Enzyme design. Structure first.
Site, mmCIF file in Angstrom:
data_model
loop_
_atom_site.group_PDB
_atom_site.id
_atom_site.type_symbol
_atom_site.label_atom_id
_atom_site.label_comp_id
_atom_site.label_asym_id
_atom_site.label_seq_id
_atom_site.Cartn_x
_atom_site.Cartn_y
_atom_site.Cartn_z
ATOM 1 N N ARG A 99 48.801 46.102 44.856
ATOM 2 C CA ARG A 99 48.142 45.816 43.570
ATOM 3 C C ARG A 99 49.104 45.810 42.382
ATOM 4 O O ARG A 99 49.128 44.874 41.574
ATOM 5 C CB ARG A 99 47.028 46.853 43.317
ATOM 6 C CG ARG A 99 46.119 46.494 42.150
ATOM 7 C CD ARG A 99 45.087 47.557 41.793
ATOM 8 N NE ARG A 99 44.416 47.122 40.565
ATOM 9 C CZ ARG A 99 43.745 47.904 39.718
ATOM 10 N NH1 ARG A 99 43.597 49.206 39.944
ATOM 11 N NH2 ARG A 99 43.206 47.370 38.628
ATOM 12 N N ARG A 180 42.854 55.933 55.477
ATOM 13 C CA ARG A 180 43.833 54.872 55.416
ATOM 14 C C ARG A 180 45.186 55.440 55.738
ATOM 15 O O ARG A 180 45.507 56.554 55.335
ATOM 16 C CB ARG A 180 43.856 54.295 54.024
ATOM 17 C CG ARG A 180 45.044 53.387 53.743
ATOM 18 C CD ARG A 180 45.102 52.972 52.267
ATOM 19 N NE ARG A 180 44.613 51.614 52.008
ATOM 20 C CZ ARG A 180 45.239 50.498 52.398
ATOM 21 N NH1 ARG A 180 46.376 50.555 53.098
ATOM 22 N NH2 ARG A 180 44.719 49.307 52.107
ATOM 23 N N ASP A 302 35.426 43.724 38.503
ATOM 24 C CA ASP A 302 34.628 44.822 39.040
ATOM 25 C C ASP A 302 33.713 45.383 37.981
ATOM 26 O O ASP A 302 32.712 46.011 38.294
ATOM 27 C CB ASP A 302 35.505 45.923 39.557
ATOM 28 C CG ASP A 302 36.162 45.593 40.866
ATOM 29 O OD1 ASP A 302 35.908 44.536 41.489
ATOM 30 O OD2 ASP A 302 36.967 46.425 41.290
ATOM 31 N N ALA A 315 38.752 40.935 44.423
ATOM 32 C CA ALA A 315 39.763 40.370 43.556
ATOM 33 C C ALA A 315 39.542 38.901 43.380
ATOM 34 O O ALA A 315 39.617 38.361 42.274
ATOM 35 C CB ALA A 315 41.139 40.585 44.165
#
Ligand SMILES: Cc1cc2nc3c(=O)[nH]c(=O)nc-3n(C[C@H](O)[C@H](O)[C@H](O)COP(=O)(O)OP(=O)(O)OC[C@H]3O[C@@H](n4cnc5c(N)ncnc54)[C@H](O)[C@@H]3O)c2cc1C
Ligand SMILES: O=C(O)c1ccccc1O
Length: 411
Positions: A99, A180, A302, A315
Site C-alpha cells: 500500500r 496473515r 472506503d 481499492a
C-alpha cells in the site's frame, strides 16, 4: 477560466491521492489534497493506465511468475487440497502491491502545490456558494466542491449523512478475522518435498475452502516469498462485536490459527505451521449507504463503501470512483453552480455498482466457507459460481461509464 473550479479532496489514500492526480492535468481546476498490502483486478487496469501509471505499476507490483501469471486463483478443498476449479484473469492474474508503495508512487508524480499535510477536518459547513472545511488547526478552507476520501472511519461520512437526514454509519466488525503471514518460499518447498506434496501449490495462487474458514496463498518477490492469509469466521451471533477498544491488529500464535483449521489436510497445515509470527486482523465493513452525496460534498473510497477483501476489489472501486470523479469535475463545461446536480449524478452512476460490490464481497466470504445457500460444499456448483462470479466486476467498461459524467439533459 477567470475563476477556476475550487476542489478540495480530504484523505491522502489512493482514492483521494488519485482523484488529485486525476484533477491535476485539468489546469482550469484548482485542487488541494488534505492490510499493509493490496490487490488489483482487471477493472483497476483501465484506471491505472489512465492516471498515467501503467508502466510503473506494472514494474513495482507483484505478479505470479510466468507462465502462471494469468491465474487469479486456483480453488481447492482444504481437507485434501483437491481441485474444485480455477479463475483465470488473462493479463492481470494475481496482481498486488504494498500500500505504502502504491500511494507513494501516485503522490510523488503530483505537481507541487496540491498536498496539504497538517490538516485534518473535524467538520464542514455550507451555503450553496460555499462549502467550508473546519480543520482541527482551528483554521479553514473553502471550495465549490469537497470530496471525502478519508476511509472506513471517515469523519466526513457522518456529517454528510446527518445533514441529508439519515442515520450515521460506523464500521461494523464482520465476524471474520484474518491471520496473515509472509513466508520464505524455499522453506516451504523443503517442507512440501519432505511430505511428498505437490509443489504446484506454491507456484500459483491458491484458495483452500473449509467450513467457516479459508486460506489463500500467492507468491510475491517473483516467487521467493509466499503471502498466506488464513480467514476464520464465527456466525453464532447474528451481529458480532469487537472489544470497545482493542486495535484492529494484534499479534497471535501459530496454534491459535491451527486450532481453527483442524479439519485441513497437510498442505494447508504445513503452510499454517510455517508462519512463525502471525498477525491477526479483525475485518470491518458497513452496510451500503442510502446516499454518497449531499449539497456540495461527496464520499469516495472506503469512506463510501468499505468492504471485506474477498473479491480483491475495494481499492479498485476507489479507483473507479476517482476516475469518474476526475472526469466529472475537470470537464471544462462544468462550473460551481452545477456541483450539487453533478454530484447527484455521480451517485446515480456509481452508488449501485459499489454497493453491490460490498455485498458480493460478503457473499464471497460465505461461498469460500461452505455457507452459500444452495451450494455449501458441493464441488460442481462451487466451481460454476467461482469461475463466473467476478465477471460483472472485471468486465466493466470505464470508458463508457465516463460518458455519463455530464450535466443532466432537461431535454
Ligand atoms: C486487513 C485489511 C486487508 C485489506 N485487503 C485488501 C485487498 O486485498 N485488496 C483491496 O483492494 N483492498 C483491501 N483492503 C481495503 C483497501 O486498503 C481499501 O479499499 C483502500 O486502501 C481504500 O481506498 P481509500 O481511498 O478509501 O483509502 P483510505 O483508507 O480512505 O485513506 C485515508 C486516510 O488518510 C487520512 C485520512 O484521515 C484517513 O485516515 C483491506 C483493508 C484491511 C483493513
Ligand atoms: O490479497 C488479499 O488479501 C485477498 C484477500 C481476499 C480475496 C482476494 C485477495 O487477493
Amino acid at each position: 477560466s477567470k475563476s477556476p473550479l475550487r476542489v478540495a479532496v480530504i484523505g491522502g489514500g489512493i482514492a483521494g491521492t488519485a482523484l488529485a492526480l486525476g484533477l491535476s492535468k485539468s489546469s482550469h481546476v484548482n485542487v488541494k489534497l488534505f492490510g499493509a498490502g493490496v490487490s488489483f483486478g482487471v477493472n483497476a487496469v483501465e484506471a491505472i493506465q489512465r492516471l498515467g501509471i501503467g508502466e510503473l505499476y506494472k514494474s513495482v507490483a507483484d505478479s505470479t511468475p510466468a507462465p502462471w501469471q494469468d491465474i487469479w486463483f486456483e480453488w481447492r478443498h482444504a481437507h485434501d487440497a483437491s481441485l474444485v476449479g480455477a479463475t483465470v484473469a488473462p493479463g492481470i492474474g494475481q496482481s498486488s502491491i504494498h500500500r505504502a508503495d502504491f500511494i507513494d508512487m501516485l503522490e510523488k508524480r503530483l505537481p507541487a502545490g496540491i498536498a496539504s499535510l497538517g490538516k485534518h477536518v473535524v467538520d464542514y459547513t455550507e451555503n450553496a456558494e460555499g462549502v467550508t472545511l473546519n480543520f482541527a488547526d482551528g483554521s479553514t478552507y473553502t471550495a465549490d466542491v469537497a470530496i471525502a476520501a478519508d476511509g472506513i472511519k471517515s469523519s466526513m461520512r457522518n456529517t454528510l449523512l446527518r445533514a441529508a437526514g439519515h442515520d450515521a454509519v460506523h464500521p461494523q466488525f464482520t465476524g471474520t478475522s484474518a491471520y496473515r503471514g509472509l513466508v520464505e518460499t524455499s522453506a516451504l518447498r523443503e517442507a512440501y518435498q519432505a511430505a511428498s506434496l505437490d509443489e504446484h501449490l506454491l507456484n500459483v495462487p491458491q484458495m483452500y475452502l473449509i467450513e467457516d474458514g479459508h486460506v489463500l496463498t500467492f507468491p510475491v518477490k517473483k516467487g521467493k516469498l509466499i503471502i498466506i492469509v488464513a480467514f476464520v469466521s464465527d456466525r453464532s451471533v447474528a451481529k458480532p462485536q469487537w472489544p470497545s477498544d482493542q486495535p484492529w491488529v494484534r499479534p497471535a500464535t501459530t496454534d491459535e490459527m491451527l486450532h481453527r483449521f483442524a479439519g485441513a489436510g497437510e498442505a494447508v497445515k504445513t503452510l499454517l505451521t510455517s508462519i512463525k509470527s502471525p498477525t491477526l486482523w479483525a475485518l470491518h465493513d458497513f452496510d451500503p449507504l442510502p446516499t454518497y452525496v449531499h449539497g456540495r460534498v461527496a464520499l469516495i473510497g472506503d469512506a463510501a463503501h468499505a468492504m471485506l477483501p474477498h473479491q480483491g476489489a475495494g481499492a479498485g472501486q476507489g479507483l473507479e470512483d476517482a476516475y469518474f470523479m476526475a472526469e466529472l469535475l475537470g470537464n471544462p463545461l462544468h462550473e460551481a453552480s452545477d456541483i450539487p446536480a453533478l454530484l447527484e449524478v455521480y451517485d446515480d452512476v456509481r452508488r449501485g455498482r459499489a454497493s453491490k460490490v460490498q455485498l458480493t464481497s460478503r457473499e464471497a466470504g460465505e461461498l469460500y466457507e461452505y455457507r452459500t445457500p444452495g451450494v455449501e460444499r458441493d464441488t460442481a456448483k462451487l466451481k460454476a459460481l467461482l469461475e463466473s462470479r467476478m465477471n460483472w466486476i472485471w468486465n466493466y467498461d470505464l470508458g463508457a461509464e465516463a460518458r455519463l459524467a455530464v450535466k443532466p439533459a432537461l431535454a
